[PDB]
Amino acid sequence: LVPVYIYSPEYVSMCDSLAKIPKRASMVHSLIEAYALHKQMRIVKPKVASMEEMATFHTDAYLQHLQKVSQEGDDDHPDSIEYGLGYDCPATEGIFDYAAAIGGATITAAQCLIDGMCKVAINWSGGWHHAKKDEASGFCYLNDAVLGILRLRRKFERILYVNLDLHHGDGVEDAFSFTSKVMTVSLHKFSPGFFPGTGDVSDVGLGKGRYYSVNVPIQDGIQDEKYYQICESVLKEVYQAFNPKAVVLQLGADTIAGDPMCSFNMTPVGIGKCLKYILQWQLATLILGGGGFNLANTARCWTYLTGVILGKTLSSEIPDHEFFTAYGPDYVLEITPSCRPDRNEPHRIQQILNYIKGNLKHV
């Protein structure tokens, strides 16, 4: 009944070495610890993913290439562009082993859920949902979300993947495009030129998986109330049509006001309402992180959401801890939205919802 928290000091230190989010894992854990939330969770040390586990999704050739350039951090290997390495996904020294640790952490969370150790298991350093079977993508090297879902498939007949990251969860949607055992639901920014460029409302999966992918394309500037209205409407319909047995929930904080991507205009309170809606289903739930490039705000967000999971109200004041000065000059947990416009028009949102309802009738 007590949530599982996937953590070790060695794991956090590996996650701190990811090129686009240095030190973020330490900031997140440190703030959770500062609020003493870890004392209310069951701390579980992650196992490292084996090659055999990784190869149930990723190809041998891709895993072999990642292992090779990882050994010394060869970010100048001529073959890396075929495998998606380059600017977004540099060959950081050690990245194969770091990604294997994150994959293993998500698999460990899934296994805890299978065993009935907990109803909620958390890996805030997971959520790297853009990686493809044979390609790094979008700061993702191994798709730990896919690996977690594939572990959950041992027991849970139907799995719902819910993505609330700013970016379309395209690697997970692709992996399960042709199956009805896994439904993917993604709320994300959709605008030509905006990464990864996929996930329109008309993208519904393929073959035997047709209508088992759901995409909610959203424009810049969305705030908590409207986002929750959308999320609740879609998940209400999804729950009734698909009857999931387990949920994997990706809560990337790059939607939050203050992110340098400056696209959505959310606060952790809005995301928290979405999370509460899912938690009241009382299903095995695997919680993942993802994007989030204002590091202090990402720690504020995931710490707040950890409190939501535990049913706790957190003090507004940021407690003293290793990274206290990163939270100045006001040192509070709450985040204020920016004063810019919401570009989501009510008629468009309604039509997207009606389109999705129409698709789900087939499910």
């Binding site: 977004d88 993508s137 979008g138 700061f139 030129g193």
Partner: peptide
């Protein structure tokens, strides 16, 4: 391919 980032 798109750039993220």
């Amino acid at each position: 391919r798109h750039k993220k980032x």
